[PDB]
Structure formats: C-alpha cells, structure tokens
Amino acid sequence: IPAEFGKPKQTANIEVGVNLPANGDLKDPTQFDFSDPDTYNRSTSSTIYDSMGQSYKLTTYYLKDQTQPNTWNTYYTVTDKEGEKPLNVAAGDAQTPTGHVGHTMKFNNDGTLASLNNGQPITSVALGDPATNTTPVDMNGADPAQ
C-alpha cells in the first residue's frame, strides 16, 4: 500500500460531452480567430497535465458553420506562460487561412451525433515538437511528443 502516488500521469485521452445551440448565429469559417471573441460562437477552458505534472490551460473554440447546416468547427489552443499557442489536428478537415487546423462536427436531423472529422479519430499534433507543430508548446523539460 504505497503512501505516495509517485507517478505523474500525462493527459492522453480527453472525453468531452457538450450540447450545442441549434439556434446560434452562423459564423464564417475563414474568419476564425481565437484572439477575436466575435469570430466564433463559444469557448471553454480546462486543465491538462504533462509528464512532469505541470498544469496547462486548454481552451477549445466552437464555431457554427454558415455554409453547411448542422455543421460545427472545433479548434484548440494551449496557454503556457509564454502565451496562448494554437494546437493543430493531425487530419482535421478545417484549415483556416492563417494555418490553424480544426475538425468538423455534423449532426443528424434529430440532433444526435452524425460524424466527427469525416469519421477519423481526433488526435492532436505533438505539443512541444517543432518538427510537427508550427507553434510548439514550451514543455519546460517535459515530453515534447505528448
């Protein structure tokens, strides 16, 4: 019976269950910008942990597509001490002109979930690896390939 939980476990899987307002105003996918609140619909904040146990702030942005009905765009950002850095999806089908990569969410007629990122699993790029991230997160000594 150990007296210490001496193994900081990095965040690997995140489950999110949300309800989106069907009557929300439509937004332009190409005008998305996390720095301007009016570009998107909603934003949520949460905490994630690296291998060393450092706390990072994960902000998820939800945008309601205007071109396609019952379609939503989701983007993620990471806020370390240096600043707020966007996080790109590995194969997300949502490319802003700046370069941010999100994923699309579609729903059926009854409001249930239809598809996520064209049926592909949602896996983000490495947080602190410059080889795959255009804005690498400052892991401050943690694992860059999380």
Next chain:
Amino acid sequence: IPAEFGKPKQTANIEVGVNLPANGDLKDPTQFDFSDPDTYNRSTSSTIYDSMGQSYKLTTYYLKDQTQPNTWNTYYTVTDKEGEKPLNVAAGDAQTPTGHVGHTMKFNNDGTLASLNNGQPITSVALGDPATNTTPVDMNGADPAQTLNFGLGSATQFAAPFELTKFDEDGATTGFLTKVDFDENGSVMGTYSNGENVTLGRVALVRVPNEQGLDKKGG
C-alpha cells in the same frame, strides 16, 4: 552481548531522496554562493559524525540550472566551530568561478531520475586533508581522510514543491544496551541508545540423524 556500542562509526554513505520543484525559479550556475540565499533555490541541513563521534552540521544547497532545462546543481558545505567551509566533489561537473565543486543532476521527461554527475559515483574529497581540500575541515583530532558517498538514486523532479522525503546515513555514536529480543530465526538483536539495531549473533542448532543413540550425560 556487550553492554556498550563502544565503536563510534564515522559516516561514510548518506542516502538522500528528494523531490525537486519543476516550477521553481531558474538560477545562474556561475552566480552560486552559499552565503547568499537568493543565489540558489533550496538548502537543507543534516548531522554527520566523524571517526571520534563528533557531530558536524552538513548543509546541502540545490540550484536549478537556467541554461539547461531539467538540470540541477548540488553543493555541500560543512559547518564546524571555526566556520562554514565548502566541500568539493572529486569528479563533480559543476565548478563555480570561486572554486567550489558541485555535481549536476538531470531528469527524464516523466520527471524520473536520468543521470547523476555524468554517470559517475558521488564521492567527496577528504574533510580534513589539506592535500586534497582547499578548505580543510577542523577534525579536532578525528581522521582527516574521511570521505562521504552520497546516494541520490531516488531523487525526482515533479510539480510538487521541494520535499526531503528520505534521509539515511551510516554514522553512529556511543551508546548503552537498552533492550534485547530474539526473532524466530534465532538472531539475538539488541538496540542501544544511539539507535543502531546491532545483531549480536545467532543461536546454533544441532540435529543428529539417530537421536536414540545419544549417550546421556548429567543435567
């Protein structure tokens, strides 16, 4: 079963297990100075014993490297009656401009221990030998060639604050027999005032193949 632990044992091996703050402020390796608390991060104190049993105050200074992430610098000082004299490592890869020699500690991505002093064992220079120490410790009659081996195989760097989890040494002081007990294995153990649980010995057991043929003496 001696009534005294009549052998003051000098400290030779010190096992220290600490958790270092990953979020601690960085410091300049070249600006380290044990007289200025702000130059380093944390300082811990402990007691050590020489050959003759004199008690000495051992202070360890931990510094967070700024140039290299997940790197720490460790320095040791000995405070006798004369003053506080820094202690140098034989092969430590941390040389301040003043001349004090420490050792470096590195950690992996998960915060576990990666390497210690470039993979070399931590052995300090002789405390009271001027031929190897620029600040010889005043042994006051004790053995000047006393050396300390530091075992930090359980050191970690996590998000938790600085913490001295474990401290174990091999030193001893003079003491008196306090209690004696016997375990199931037959080892007769006795604890003294110093705290060492010295095992006096075991109880011999004899078995013969055919017990019916033993000749019967008196008593």
